[PDB]
Amino acid sequence: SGFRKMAFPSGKVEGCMVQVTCGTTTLNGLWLDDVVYCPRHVICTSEDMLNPNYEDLLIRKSNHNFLVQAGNVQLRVIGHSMQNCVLKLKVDTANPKTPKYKFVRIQPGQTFSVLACYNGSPSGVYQCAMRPNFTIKGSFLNGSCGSVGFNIDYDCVSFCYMHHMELPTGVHAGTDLEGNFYGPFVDRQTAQAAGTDTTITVNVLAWLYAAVINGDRWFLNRFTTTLNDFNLVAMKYNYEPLTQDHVDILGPLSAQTGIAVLDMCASLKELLQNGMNGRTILGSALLEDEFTPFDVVRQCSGVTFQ
Amino acid sequence: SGFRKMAFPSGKVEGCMVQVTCGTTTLNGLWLDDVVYCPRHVICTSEDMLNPNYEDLLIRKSNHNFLVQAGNVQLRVIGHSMQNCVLKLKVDTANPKTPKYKFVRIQPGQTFSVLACYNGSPSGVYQCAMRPNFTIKGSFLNGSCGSVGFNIDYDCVSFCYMHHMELPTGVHAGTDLEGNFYGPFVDRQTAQAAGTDTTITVNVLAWLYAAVINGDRWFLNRFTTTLNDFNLVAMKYNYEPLTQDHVDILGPLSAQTGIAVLDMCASLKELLQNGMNGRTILGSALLEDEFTPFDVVRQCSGVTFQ
Ligand SMILES: CCc1ccc(Cc2ccc3c(c2)[C@]2(OC3)O[C@H](CO)[C@@H](O)[C@H](O)[C@@H]2O)cc1
Ligand SMILES: CCc1ccc(Cc2ccc3c(c2)[C@]2(OC3)O[C@H](CO)[C@@H](O)[C@H](O)[C@@H]2O)cc1
Ligand SMILES: [Cl-]
Numbered sequence A, B: 001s002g003f004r005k006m007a008f009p010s011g012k013v014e015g016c017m018v019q020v021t022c023g024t025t026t027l028n029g030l031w032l033d034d035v036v037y038c039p040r041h042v043i044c045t046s047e048d049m050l051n052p053n054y055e056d057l058l059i060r061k062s063n064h065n066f067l068v069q070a071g072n073v074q075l076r077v078i079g080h081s082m083q084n085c086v087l088k089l090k091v092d093t094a095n096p097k098t099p100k101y102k103f104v105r106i107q108p109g110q111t112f113s114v115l116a117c118y119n120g121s122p123s124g125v126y127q128c129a130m131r132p133n134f135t136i137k138g139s140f141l142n143g144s145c146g147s148v149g150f151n152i153d154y155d156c157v158s159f160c161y162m163h164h165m166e167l168p169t170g171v172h173a174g175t176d177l178e179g180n181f182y183g184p185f186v187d188r189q190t191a192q193a194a195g196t197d198t199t200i201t202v203n204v205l206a207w208l209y210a211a212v213i214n215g216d217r218w219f220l221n222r223f224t225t226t227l228n229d230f231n232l233v234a235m236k237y238n239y240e241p242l243t244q245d246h247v248d249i250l251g252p253l254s255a256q257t258g259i260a261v262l263d264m265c266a267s268l269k270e271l272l273q274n275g276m277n278g279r280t281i282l283g284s285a286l287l288e289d290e291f292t293p294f295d296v297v298r299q300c301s302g303v304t305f306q
């Protein structure tokens, strides 16, 4: 036992990272089959970003202007095109390391792993979640744009995110692999502010289920509640309303533990009202919301990937 | 910016994981060059573990009894030998994926990443630290024995840990790659209890330096202290005494931030005495001690690995 914020093994995605340089800008790209995906702002300069017209900035570029390096070998670019906020560079070699993969657009509250990269070289891996206000709370220095978020199922990598920018508040915005941003964010430097960072209540309960499975049970109480009562409390603490679909996704953890979902909501409610009183749950002194119900089951079941 | 508990990319180690079965027991092994390392308790049954005599249990084994599978291909075992608590199985093929690597025995307070594996297949990766009482607080289900902890420098993997067992308290014990356990723990089921889980003060300050670099500065105050005063406080809160070598390792973060190490200790001191008052630092409501000073510099500098 033990429960930890665990990322997916990163090897399969490490094999797709490449460096992309246009003019003076270098960032990362993702090499899948014979196509290299990267943020389109690689073609921008520093003022270019105040109010760029990418359609016009790309007119000045040709295939030979995009220097793509995979490890120490240069890749040949035979085509380029813009799709939403991403450029797709067609190279003349298929990546030999391409895993089986899919492109998916995730929902707020879902989690995924990030392989932070600089200059096409991996730096580290950590788990993140798509926040209800559509930002992620990552770790990104300059040059990390183009690093991707992903989940792995069996032997299929589902890419879900590509990094594009940092708000003045230090949180992060990006796109899916079709180039569409999560949320209202745009790839220009402007007054962009994030909405409320509401907590993903269904992940919190999942994590409370994890704790009981992993021996922490002090928060369990003699009470129960209803969805309509619970939700008055979640609305007061800036929590996502809990829904019947969520109660349903929590069924399996409820079955394995024998603790009814609504009794667990009653545990969460008292914790919101009274705090933890200086105690801890799974090593944390605050309620954790970046573990989905699939993530607790997966980690508590030892699911592996081939 | 942003600061997160980041693991090392796991691809290089994913290429060394293999399944090891002796009789009915399956666990993981590490395939480096032509040798496969795994816990010696793979040769034990269930009662065998109360007070095993591995010397005698191994006398009953031969090379053909150790079934080593790498992905879907079986490996041929041409030799086996015990070194402390690990068995070394010599196979007739060198692993083609062997990275450059080293075996190191770490010091308490040092951190490393774990690639949790089941049946020779990776499941996830997370960062851990060797605790002052020589246990690690991991995530391990049955079948995870043999998963390794590691750090990567440049393109050299320094293996530092191999998982072997769980104490009744849910914390974990293991060995280095030479087969010697960290701490007093032995590979038998007995009354083994962990000593105090003291906090690694030099990592805490490192993380306080990370927070200031990442915009959290509310804990900074108008005070300073001395090592001898500070240490009276660390001793009262079950913190490791801070030493001059530690002040020295913190120099670079002190230089980059302009906050004197002893002023930062004065910040840590008030936090120990008054608590955080319901606020948070780098997203945590408690003081984090599993980031070493090298880990903050590395993550805040974008160091990558080839
Ligand atoms: C085969 C051995 C094994 C596997 C997994 C676990 C841990 C575990 C954690 C979390 C969940 C579950 C199991 C699970 O879903 C939520 O529990 C449901 C009700 O018992 C069950 O119907 C599901 O098939 C599923 O096992 C223990 C032992
Ligand atoms: C080249 C661009 C760059 C690199 C790294 C960073 C972040 C950074 C974080 C943490 C530390 C340091 C830097 C560092 O050690 C601790 O700061 C010391 C005093 O300035 C310096 O002497 C060291 O070389 C080292 O830069 C910013 C910009
Ligand atoms: Cl916390």
Ligand SMILES: [Cl-]
Pocket (backbone or CB within 6 Å): A005, B005
């Ligand atoms: Cl974490």
